[PDB]
Design a protein around this nucleic acid. Structure first.
Lengths: 74, 34, 47, 67
RNA sequence: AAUCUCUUUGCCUUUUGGCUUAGAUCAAGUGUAGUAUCUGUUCUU
RNA sequence: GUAUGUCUAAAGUUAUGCUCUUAUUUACUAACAAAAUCAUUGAACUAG
């Protein structure tokens, strides 16, 4: 099917510039901030093991991401 | 297979390895199902 | 008549349909490929 | 009731029969076997070709080493 | 000096037009009907 | 069963081998269908 398309070019505002507009009043265009501001001017020896014997620019491999995965996947 | 040959089923059995076996030739009369 | 366990031996005809199907659907649509085969599942076609 | 049971038994039988392709028919086992036995024939033939000249290798070695 | 057809080179000339959780899941069914379809037999050729 | 789309057709007159007969196989489609074991009970009900 061809109805699913990438954009070849974006719609230009020049088209709307020629249209005759309507008088709808939008809530976001109501008066607000009407004034501008200006600047001035032995138990330890019986085991086989023991003492007796970083940022990188790649999210998917940063330690932060690894600990996130270890924390949320179990 | 090579390891075995380098160290030197049955009717009604399930073949566990069927996906790796050689293809059975099409005999000249194709069955209606095929 | 239903078929609950699929498999058996791969015939040549099945291999040829599988190859034609892969040429069309690629290698990530094994259910669509197996849908053309009567005796084989998606996982068996992928294998 | 006996009828309905017998017919469900027969249809179950048809299903059990229809799934027989999942097993190795004797014709599948024979088909692999020949490939094994004709592979062993190839191996025998090649090995015979190898050792039918490997024994005579010393006689030609002596002949070539003369000059 | 001017035609026609080959062959190579160039041109590709009806020569894959987005996105997400591969977007998701499913592929067991009776009667009758509808459409397409299959083997065979005579017939057409 | 929808969304939704299409149709509605005179008059209210504008001057000049390859097929066929036919018995099957297979697939798809059907808001078509009250189908006999497992004092009478699916029963008018389901849609993006």
């Amino acid at each position: 099917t061809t109805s699913h398309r990438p954009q070849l070019e974006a719609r230009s505002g020049a088209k709307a510039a020629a249209y005759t507009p309507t008088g709808i009043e939008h809530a976001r265009l109501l008066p607000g901030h009407t004034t501008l501001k200006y600047r001035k001017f032995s138990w330890r020896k019986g085991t086989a093991f023991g003492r007796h014997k970083g940022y990188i620019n790649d999210m998917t491999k940063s330690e932060y991401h690894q600990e996130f995965l270890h924390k949320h996947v179990r | 297979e090579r390891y075995n040959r380098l160290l030197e089923l049955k009717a009604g059995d399930i073949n566990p390895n069927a996906e790796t076996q050689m293809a059975r030739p099409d005999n000249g009369d194709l069955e209606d199902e095929e | 008549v239903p078929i609950y366990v699929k498999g058996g031996v791969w015939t040549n005809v099945e291999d040829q349909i599988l190859k034609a199907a892969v040429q069309k659907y690629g290698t990530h649509q094994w259910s669509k490929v197996a849908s053309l085969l009567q005796k084989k599942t998606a996982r068996q076609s992928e294998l | 009731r006996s009828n309905a049971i017998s017919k469900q038994k027969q249809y179950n039988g048809l299903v059990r029969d229809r799934e027989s392709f999942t097993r190795l028919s004797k014709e599948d086992l024979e088909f692999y076997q020949k490939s094994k036995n004709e592979l062993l024939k190839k191996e025998k033939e090649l090995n015979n070709y190898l050792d039918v000249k490997a024994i005579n290798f010393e006689k030609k070695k002596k002949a070539l080493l003369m000059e």
